[PDB]
Amino acid sequence: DVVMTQIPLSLPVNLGDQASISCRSSQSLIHSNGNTYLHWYLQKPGQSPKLLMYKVSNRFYGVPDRFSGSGSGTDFTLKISRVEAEDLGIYFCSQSSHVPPTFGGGTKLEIKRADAAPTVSIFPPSSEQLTSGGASVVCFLNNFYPKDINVKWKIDGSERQNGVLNSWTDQDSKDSTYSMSSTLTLTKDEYERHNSYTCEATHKTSTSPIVKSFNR
Amino acid sequence: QIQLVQSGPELKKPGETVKISCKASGYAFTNYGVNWVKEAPGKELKWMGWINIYTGEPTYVDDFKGRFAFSLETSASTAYLEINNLKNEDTATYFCTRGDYVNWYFDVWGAGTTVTVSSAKTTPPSVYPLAPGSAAQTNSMVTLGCLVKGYFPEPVTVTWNSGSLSSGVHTFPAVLQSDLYTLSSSVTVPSSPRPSETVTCNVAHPASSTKVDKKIVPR
Ligand SMILES: CC(=O)[C@H]1CC[C@H]2[C@@H]3CC[C@H]4C[C@@H](OC(=O)CCC(=O)O)CC[C@]4(C)[C@H]3CC[C@]12C
Helix, strand or coil, rough: CCCEECCCCCECCCCCCEEEEEECCCCCCCCCCCCEEEEEEEECCCCEEEEEEEEECCCCCCCCCCCEECCCCEEEEEEECCCHHHHHCEEEEEEECCCCCCEEEEEEEEECCEEEECCCEECCCCCCHCCCCCCCEEEEEEEEEECCCCCEECCCCEEEECHHHHCEECCCCCCCEEEEEEEEECHHHHHHCCCCCCEEECCCCCCCCCCCEEEE | CCCCEEEEEECCCCCCCCEEEEEECCHHHHHEEEEEEEEECCCCEEEEEECCCCCCEEECCCHHCCEEEEECCCCCHHEEEECCCHHHHHCCCEEEEEEEECCCEEEEECCEEEEECCCCCCCCCCEEECCCCCCCCCCCCCEEEEEEEECCCCCCCEEHHHHCEECCCCCCCCCECCEEEEEEEEEEEECCHHHHHCCCCEEEEEEEEEEEEEEEECC
């Protein structure tokens, strides 16, 4: 299967600039018939994909001339002249020359902002849950950019790796940042075996970790 | 308008069967193939197979051999994909696209149809409050949050103060624990509001006709 690998995964375009997505094939997309069938889709949030352009460089009906395509043989490059808010979402390059048409990659166009560090909050198990014998510790890593963040749960100093559950929110519509919660859930007995529970946030924007704790 | 119109969202247990409807209109049905596309969480957009209106017969890509069956009822312009003996791994969104014989692209995509496979029975969530345990003004600000844990099926709706609090609200996407859903929301307010003034989260689970209001009381 011709595996399309395209990167970057996230393109923090600065609205208004020229942006370049590139895509590459694990084979030549050059057919016996003497043409290249590399196509380009665009899928806005929670929706169906759209045909954007076909055969490496032909704009499908609708696609304003802001979109431009290019390449040959194995490397391709979709290019947006001056980006516009209307055209942000994930981008897929599928080729229909060999069997099967493989879709690869997925490059999402996101916005670029000044680096932000996270408003990391930590919460102990509310009475209600303890009374039912569960124990959920909740750390809220809030309002930060860039999108990647590494979280560590140290319980008595010793790191825990299992009992975890992370969830992110994609770029906030009105403040270009991200957010994530880390939910270390453990049994009440595992819980009151110890004091000290701490959340650890190693992020681009900081010299040393961001730590947060409560002592049970 | 010209489109492929697909069936509604299915919730099936394992070993069942699903028949997704792909009804075409506005265009000459016989002279385009109907292609099918599986989209899976995190997984790639994976071309599943094809259906030839001309001749009828259908082509399957290896992965979707046999259990997946490409039907067709031409008079009626509808195309069908059927999965039998749903494994828990079939949870995805299925697209049907209008495939073109000349440039071989897929230009008219259907809205999609989500299959969710699970042996979980309808369950109400447990709305726990999460009050600080005593932290200070980071810089004159407080953040509370509710933890809607243990439900099925999706979705749950969480509002603070019944819609009044939008900003600072970050409802995180439902994640899974043993078939059931666990999800959380956080609201951030100025130190003046709490506790001078009340903050609450309203958790509604339409699936089981339950609305819960847990008032965040201090610690
Ligand atoms: C109408 C319709 O549905 C269209 C949409 C996409 C089209 C298919 C896309 C892939 C190509 C592969 C081609 O390559 C080859 O010649 C074989 C050798 C190789 O694959 O490298 C042969 C036909 C097919 C399979 C196309 C037939 C018609 C399709 C199905």
